């Protein structure tokens, strides 16, 4: 904001209203692999989802 004629407010009196949690980010980084003997259980090595 303009004070005088050439001097401008370098920083203003701005009061914050607090904080909040705006989002919950599902981090879809790949998990590890469990080695099993069952033949009916599979795993997606990379991007992809099974369909139901």
């Amino acid at each position: 904001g303009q004070s005088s004629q050439n001097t401008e407010l370098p920083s203003g009196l701005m009061l914050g209203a607090g904080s909040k949690v705006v989002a919950t980010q599902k981090v879809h980084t790949h998990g590890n692999a469990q080695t099993t003997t069952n033949a009916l259980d599979m795993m997606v090595e990379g991007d992809g989802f099974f369909q139901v």
């Binding site: 080695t35 069952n38 033949a39």
Partner: protein, 72 residues
């Protein structure tokens, strides 16, 4: 452990059969016996053969080898 315990029983059956032949080294008309074994593998629909080991050793039959013996 069960596959190892199968091996001990198979190895013990051979030893018992061999001992029986030696014990009857003098009896008249005796015919020696030979122990024969067989493998075991049984894989379910839900089991992935590529990651499976065998079931051990199974005794198949104790024969009765009937070849002619020496004459006294």
């Amino acid at each position: 452990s069960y596959v190892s315990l199968s091996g001990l029983s198979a190895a013990q059956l051979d030893l018992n059969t061999t001992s029986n032949n030696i014990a009857n080294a003098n009896t008249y008309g005796f015919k020696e016996s030979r122990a024969e074994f067989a493998d075991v593998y049984s894989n379910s629909l839900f089991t992935n053969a590529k990651t499976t080991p065998g079931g051990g050793a199974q005794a198949s039959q104790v024969a009765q080898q009937f070849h002619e013996g020496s004459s006294i």
